[PDB]
Amino acid sequence: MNFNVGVDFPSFIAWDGEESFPVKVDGFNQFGFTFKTIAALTAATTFNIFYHEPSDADPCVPGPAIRVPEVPFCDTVLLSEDGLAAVTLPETVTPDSFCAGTVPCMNGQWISIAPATGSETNAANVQITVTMKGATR
Amino acid sequence: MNFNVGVDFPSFIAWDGEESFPVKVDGFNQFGFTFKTIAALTAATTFNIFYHEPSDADPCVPGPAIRVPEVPFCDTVLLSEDGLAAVTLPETVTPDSFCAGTVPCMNGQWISIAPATGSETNAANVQITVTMKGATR
Amino acid sequence: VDVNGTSTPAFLAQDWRRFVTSFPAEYGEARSVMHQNVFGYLAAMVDANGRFLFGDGDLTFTPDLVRERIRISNCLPDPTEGNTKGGTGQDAFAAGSFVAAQAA
Amino acid sequence: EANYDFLSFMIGAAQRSHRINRNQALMIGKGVNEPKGWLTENCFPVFQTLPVDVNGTSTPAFLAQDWRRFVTSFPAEYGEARSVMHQNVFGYLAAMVDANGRF
Amino acid sequence: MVKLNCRPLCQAPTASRLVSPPCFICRGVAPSAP
């Protein structure tokens, strides 16, 4: 008795192993992340979050990819040396285990994920996609 | 205040425009499909659906892609060539415009989507994902 | 103990009785502490005949440990690591692994 | 007519079929339209006894020691646990024999 | 809508075997030799 859940929480590709994809998050108001590997990893992997602004040439296309600054919560013990938002998939994840994450503060209209340099080898086996929650219109 | 929605409706890739991937839904109870068009198409894009069963070699690996059967209901009066569940994204669908789909009756362990014979070149510019719901595992 | 020439470590009910009886009696009543894994590995002891060394003929061995002065615990080092390290081949107890204790 | 009341016969051998299929499902119900059987769910801790080598064969088997441990190895902090199996397995256990020949 | 009904004439018996748990064996004895 499944419901059509394409009319609610529609997912979109973000990183298909070797290509980033800015997805529009304006109409939506909440969004998370699912990390799924197709093989085993070799070393720990890191992924950098970016965001785009509407390029003046057209309001419905992403502009450049500007960096996202991670905002600290309470009870924090460490900060990224630059303050920049980035997630990490730890080593020893078997490719039948999805992994969750979510940025607590949005900025821009298109979110994007890129393989942090020096870790793009495992990136191929990694696939990151995004789901959302709201329509608002 | 975007909740961590990785858990509580995650999702995975199903068809990256190049190849299919059976996405386990046996551990789930409700699910659905989300299409996405990246470029203007040429004609109606038909997609065959399939369901899989666990290989006797390993209960955690897909077997073959058995043909999911189309099921009718109250006003279903347009059955296909004896009934084989398969969908079709129509023409006149611009980019940044996602679609929704579902299968009324689940069968097997996981689902898979393939470009119907003749829609491959059009399928080259589509990306299809699957999103689950609620499950207790 | 020896096996096929190899001298892997092990543990026998004889050694258990030796340890529990070796307490200086004049001290006083000294109870013992151990993991349920150890008591299970013990109650499942089989002789060369094929008989259970304890509770012979009722598929289980269950004496009241209070009478047998044994308090049980479950977050002790548990020498049978994950209840999988009895030892005939590569399952040796890895000599240097706590088994049990006893005190007043 | 036809004195034997078919109505009550069916009213009985509908609930009987329903009950037996309910039990079968809740035991091994395979996902779709079948309540998930705890057998096929396969997240229970499952212990497999190691085989025995009879004149160099490494033949699978099962002796009373494994059973007694599998019953006792249950963490008592969870509470009282009951065991379920076939009567064939029970007769198999009651038919065990030592090397000398005694039951 | 003629419904059929058929029964056999002569029935055949049913035999079977009664395999039973084997000898007690040791999956490793302590005092042994290579």
Partner: peptide, 22 residues
């Protein structure tokens, strides 16, 4: 930051028992 699993994969738990050790 919160990670999951799909299959049980708890199949092999080979319990060992004290053989005839004498």
């Amino acid at each position: 930051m919160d990670c999951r699993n799909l299959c049980g994969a708890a199949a092999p738990s080979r319990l060992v028992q004290p053989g005839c050790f004498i």
